[PDB]
Amino acid sequence: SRQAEVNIGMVGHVDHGKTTLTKALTGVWTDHSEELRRGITIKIGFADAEIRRCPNCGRYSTSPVCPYCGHETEFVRRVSFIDAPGHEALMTTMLAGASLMDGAILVIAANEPCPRPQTREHLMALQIIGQKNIIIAQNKIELVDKEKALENYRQIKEFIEGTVAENAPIIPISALHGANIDVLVKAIEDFIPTPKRDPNKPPKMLVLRSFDVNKPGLVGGVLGGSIVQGKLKVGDEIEIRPGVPYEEHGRIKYEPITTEIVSLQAGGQFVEEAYPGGLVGVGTKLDPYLTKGDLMAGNVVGKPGKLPPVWDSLRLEVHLLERVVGTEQELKVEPIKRKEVLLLNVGTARTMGLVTGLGKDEIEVKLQIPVCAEPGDRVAISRQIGSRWRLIGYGIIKE
Ligand SMILES: [Zn+2]
């Protein structure tokens, strides 16, 4: 298996070199329709990269040809970089789907004095989800002098003290010129090693997309998602929850569906077995009508009888965010009131929630759409402040 082994979050303002850096790492330079593979509940995108090492000079890179001496490099490990369109999307992705991230690269521009508001929230989110496999990329060093670079470095050290990023390496880089990229890649190997996963645990996949690949104007329905536990294998019998909607006595219910895995695609190739890391394509025997147009997006996949429960309503222990990004009042966040209709994101699932009850640092919400989740799972909570959805906190599913 040559598929991605870890998902690495590209956490940084959408303009501190973050894009230039991601492309430098993935080697993708052609103007990118994987934009059609991105999530539509949480807008997470994946971009694989193969970490390789040069036998001649020993330096690491993500190219088959060493950028430093021109010799052929040796394969080390494939990884996948995950990102989202803009600050709000990224924050929601981290709070709702921490299990999709194994480490992160915090991009900080040395070109800028004090730690920016977005950067402050980025670290706030990493702290909340307990993601400690962090690497700090001090980008754009080619735009500032030697002294301001060292000053920025000091500010960063003070910024990370006492946080999940305290022990993270700070790597001065120039994504544009390619300076110190080899140091960053090796750091990915040293600080974001592949976790020691128990491949025997019950499989679980969070479905991001679903389609009818039948070429028209035949193949079973196809699912696209992330394996967060165990492994999947061609021929396995799988169950999908909540499942297909159906009406019963003027009410909408969901029937879990069981099917069989016909094929698996990961790392750009068909495989007989897939694991956590990167996007995984799942060919099934399902009637294509059931997966067409992302009907299964947000669903959870596992083996029959071994999936998390389905909830029609949730009791959430709520933690409101003390945000720093937004207009003057958008930061005040008024307490949650009964009858409010909130936007909830859990895993890759997305549903509106009507607040029907309140408790101490707790709310009870009736869901528009049932969700498949485990007690203890984290749920991002958003409020429609005007005409847009703004993240205001997160909840922990209570039993
Ligand atoms: Zn070399």
- Residue 275 near residue 282, CB atoms below 8 Å: no
Q: Which two tokens stand for residue 348?
A: 């890759």
Residue 102's CB is within 10 A of a number of other CB atoms, namely: 23
CA distances from 271 to 235, 267, 284 (A): 12, 9, 14
Q: Which residues pair with 237 in a beta bridge?
A: 260
| 302 vs 279: CA distance, rounded Å | 16
Tallying the residues shown for the chain, one arrives at 399
Question: How much distance in Å is there from the Cα of 79 to the middle of ligand 1?
Answer: 21
- Give the β-pairing of 74-83 and 7-11: parallel
- Residue 227 near residue 202, CB atoms below 8 Å: no
Ligand 1 ion: residues within 5 Å (CB): 54, 56-57, 66, 68-69, 71
Q: Which two tokens stand for residue 263?
A: 């094929």
Question: How much distance in Å is there from the Cα of 56 to the middle of ligand 1?
Answer: 5
**What percent helix, strand, coil does the chain show, rounded to 5?**
20, 40, 40
Q: How was this structure determined?
A: X-ray
The answer to whether 327 is a known ligand-binding residue is: no
DSSP conformational letter for 174: B
- Residue 212 near residue 289, CB atoms below 8 Å: yes
Domains annotated for the chain, with CATH where assigned, are 1-197 (3.40.50.300), 198-307 (2.40.30.10), 308-399 (2.40.30.10)
Query: Which residues have a Cβ under 8 Å from the Cβ of 113 and sit 6 or more positions away?
Result: 152, 155
| 35 vs 46: CA distance, rounded Å | 9
Question: How much distance in Å is there from the Cα of 73 to the middle of ligand 1?
Answer: 7
Query: Which residues have a Cβ under 8 Å from the Cβ of 215 and sit 6 or more positions away?
Result: none
* 136 closest CA partner among 200, 89, 191: 191
Q: Coil, helix or strand for 56?
A: coil
Q: Which two tokens stand for residue 284?
A: 């099934």
Please report where in the chains the tokens 């009507």 appear, as a residue. Answer: 354
- Give the β-pairing of 134-139 and 60-61: unpaired
- Residue 381 near residue 352, CB atoms below 8 Å: no
The answer to whether 39 is a known ligand-binding residue is: yes
DSSP string for 36-53: TTS-SSS--EEEEEEEEE
Question: How much distance in Å is there from the Cα of 58 to the middle of ligand 1?
Answer: 6
| 216 vs 212: CA distance, rounded Å | 10
Query: Between vectors from CA 29 to CA 23 and to CA 33, what angle results, nearest 5°?
Result: 90
The answer to whether 225 is a known ligand-binding residue is: no
Question: Å resolution of this model?
Answer: 2.0
What is the separation of C-alpha 242 from the centre of its chain, rounded to a whole number of angstroms? Answer: 21
Q: Coil, helix or strand for 189?
A: helix
Buried b (16+ CB within 10 A) or exposed e, 188-206: beebbebeebeeeeebbbb
DSSP conformational letter for 73: P
DSSP conformational letter for 278: S
- Give the β-pairing of 204-211 and 349-359: unpaired
Question: How much distance in Å is there from the Cα of 60 to the middle of ligand 1?
Answer: 8
